[PDB]
Every structure is written in C-alpha cells, then in structure tokens.
C-alpha cells in the first residue's frame, strides 16, 4: 500500500472543473490553481529567451479517466487530475509541479473544519517535467496502490 505520481490518459468526455493558465517566459515563475490546489513552479531557464509559452493545466474530476490501478484491492485516486495545456511541449529544464494530495485517512472522511486542509497542501505530489507529452488526453494523477 502506497501512493505516488502517475500519468493517466483521458478516454471519454473528461470533466474539467478547474483550469489553470499562465504565459511563462524564460524569466520563469509559477502557476497556482486554488480551484484545486495545484501549483507549477518553473525554474528560471526552463523556457528559452525571446519566447512566450502559454502553459495551462486543467484539473478534471476522477470519473472520465483510464485508471490502471486496481480498485478491487483498494487502489484509487486521491489527487485532482491534470490536463497539460499545450501538447508536445519541451522545456530546456524540468518544471516542478505540485498537486494537492492529502493523507489516505480522509480518503472517505466528511472532512472536519478542525483541519480539512492540514496535509491537503503538505503531502503534495511533486513531479519534474522537462517536456510535456502529446496525447489525446495525457493527464496526471496520483496512484493509490493497494
């Protein structure tokens, strides 16, 4: 039993509930998405000079996706999916992507006001992207093993 980062694919009509977008230049910067809690930090250099790349990640719901995990054993998704804006992107340096992944304790908890955001932002999933693949629905997603 363990959790990690994985790149899932979208088959049917994906459910886009959140959409983060931000044009980034060689200068660098980060793209935060409060709608879900996902933030992408780009190191000063990932993007070349004299260029402007519109990087937007759309956070979808966990319903219209192809989860390779095994729910029969208990596996599942505890992190909001993501849809890479541009398809076939290649940075000069890897970008740090962070997702709002909480502990498995709240996997089915009603969520109390005492600390419903405690680890929601602490145990975030970090993934480095130098180049973003190009697929019909190359999305991300935390894999909850069983």
From Swiss-Prot:
It comes from the Eukaryota. The alpha-containing isoform is found in most epithelial cell junctions. The short isoform is found both in endothelial cells and the highly specialized epithelial junctions of renal glomeruli and Sertoli cells of the seminiferous tubules. Coiled coil: none annotated. Residues 18-132 form the ZU5 domain. Phosphorylated at tyrosine redidues in response to epidermal growth factor (EGF). This response is dependent on an intact actin microfilament system. Dephosphorylated by PTPRJ. Homodimer. Forms heterodimers TJP3. Forms a heterodimer (via PDZ2 domain) with TJP2/ZO2 (via PDZ2 domain). Interacts with OCLN, CALM, claudins, CGN/cingulin, CXADR, GJA12, GJD3 and UBN1. Interacts (via ZU5 domain) with CDC42BPB and MYZAP. Interacts (via PDZ domain) with GJA1. Interacts (via PDZ domains) with ANKRD2. Interacts with POPDC1 (via the C-terminus cytoplasmic tail). Interacts with HSPA4 and KIRREL1. Interacts with DLL1. Interacts with USP53 (via the C-terminal region). Interacts (via ABR region) with F-actin. Belongs to the MAGUK family. This is Tight junction protein 1. It comes from Homo sapiens (Human). The lineage of its organism: Eukaryota, Metazoa, Chordata, Craniata, Vertebrata. The gene is TJP1. The chain holds residues 1631 to 1748 of 1748 of the full protein.
């Amino acid at each position: 039993h363990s959790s990690g980062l994985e790149v899932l694919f979208q088959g049917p009509g994906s459910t886009v509930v959140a959409t983060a977008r931000g044009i980034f230049n060689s200068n660098g910067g980060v793209l935060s998405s409060i709608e879900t809690g996902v933030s992408i930090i780009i190191p000063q250099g990932a993007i070349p000079e004299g260029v402007e790349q519109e990087i937007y990640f759309k956070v979808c719901r966990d319903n219209s996706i192809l989860p390779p995990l095994d729910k029969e054993k208990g596996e599942t998704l505890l992190s909001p999916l993501v849809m890479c804006g541009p398809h076939g992107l290649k940075f000069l340096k890897p970008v740090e992507l962070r997702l709002p992944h909480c502990d498995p304790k709240t996997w089915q908890n009603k969520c109390l006001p005492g600390d419903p955001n405690y680890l929601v932002g602490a145990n975030c999933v970090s993934v480095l992207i130098d180049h973003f693949g190009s697929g019909s629905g190359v999305v991300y997603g935390v894999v909850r093993r069983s």
